[PDB]
Amino acid sequence: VTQTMKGLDIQKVAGTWYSLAMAASDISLLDAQSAPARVYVEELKPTPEGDLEFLLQKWENGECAQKKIIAEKTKIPAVFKIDALNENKVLVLDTDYKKYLLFCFENSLACQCLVRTPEVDDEALEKFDKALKALPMHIRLSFNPTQLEEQC
Amino acid sequence: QTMKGLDIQKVAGTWYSLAMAASDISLLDAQSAPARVYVEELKPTPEGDLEFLLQKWCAQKKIIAEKTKIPAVFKIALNENKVLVLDTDYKKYLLFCFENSLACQCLVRTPEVDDEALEKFDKALKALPMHIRLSFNPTQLEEQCH
């Protein structure tokens, strides 16, 4: 992954979002409701220090569990580091702030198309497909408006 | 949009499932999902039907798709699916769909990633209600049930 957003201002991404589409380097990252990269973004919360907190939903033991991840700022404004056993980077590819945001979790690679409103946005999905060009993706999922409003 | 003038003697032989897509995530998500089937071979029958030799999670299955009045449209009796051949160049790639829900595949003649085949599959899928897409590496193409 090399296309990160030039000039990102995370103070303009705060609020509630919907995971519209998802793609991963391995089928087993996304295939099951319980698969590792199968996490729905509920909220983005930039911190005053310029870190990016994610509020996630995960299907866990047959219900929808909430999880908080803190992605710490780096020298590069569109690149954040998650403290974990192995370094996990968050790469923000693109956003127009008002409608859609595209990002990737990189160890294995899992990317998402987020939208502000729970409707299918064909422009956002076209931009997601362009940004995914040449990434080693083996699985892609997209959700209908019904699924966007449902827990997980 | 089905393959005009399909020649079933020319599609005969060995194939590999390179990519697949489906209208519903649950048709392809699990190794045992209903549309999760790997095409190993197509044979014509003398009656002009098309035999598919498939692997499914790893069981082998032989399915006869009966000709219909429409060229390149076959039928496979209890859970009736139409088989729609979208396009093939015979020598490299074949694109087809199972329609009741819709599950489509990109087949290639050799167990290698083919740029043209995947581009033609993506084009064909552009105006279809797909919600899941899978692609396999060459290692998986040579293995039982990928």
Q: Do B131 and A142 touch (CB under 8 A)?
A: yes
CATH topology for the B1-146 domain: Lipocalin (2.40.128)
Cβ burial, residue B46 (10 Å; 0-12/13-18/19+): exposed
Within 8 A by CB and 6+ apart from B107, the residues are B15, B16, B17, B18, B39, B93, B94, B95, B96
Structure tokens at B77: 């009796």
Interface of A with B in 14-53 (CB under 8 A): 27, 31-32
A139 lies within 8 A of chain B by CB: yes
Interface of B with A in 72-131 (CB under 8 A): 130-131
Q: How was this structure obtained?
A: X-ray
H-type alpha helices, B17-146? 115-125, 138-142
Instruction: Categorise residue B139: left if φ over 0, alpha if ψ from -120 to 50, beta otherwise.
Output: alpha
Q: How many CA atoms lie within 13 A of A63 on its CB side?
A: 2
B145 neighbourhood in chain A, CB within 8 Å: none
C-alpha of B78 from chain center: 20
Q: Which long-range contacts (CB under 8 A, 24 or more apart) does A3-6 make?
A: A3/A93, A3/A94, A3/A131, A4/A76, A4/A78, A4/A79, A4/A91, A4/A92, A4/A93, A5/A78, A5/A92, A5/A93, A5/A94, A5/A95, A6/A78
Report DSSP letters for A68-121, one per residue: EEEEEE-SSTTEEEE-SSS-EEEEEEEE-SSSEEEEEEE--EEEEEEESSSS--
Sign of the torsion angle spanned by Cα atoms A97, A65, A144, B121: positive
CATH topology for the A2-152 domain: Lipocalin (2.40.128)
φ, ψ dihedrals at A86, nearest 5°: -110, 140
For residue B119, give the DSSP letter: H
B27 neighbourhood in chain A, CB within 8 Å: none
Q: Which residue from B87, B82, B88, B80 is spatially nearest to B69, judged by alpha carbons? A: B82
Residue B121's identity, in one-letter code, is: F
- Going from N- to C-terminal start, the domains of chain B cover 1-146
Coil, strand or helix: which one is B86? strand
- Dihedral angle computed from the Cα positions of residues B36, B38, B42 and B48, in that order, rounded to the nearest 10 degrees: -10
Strand partners, B13: B42
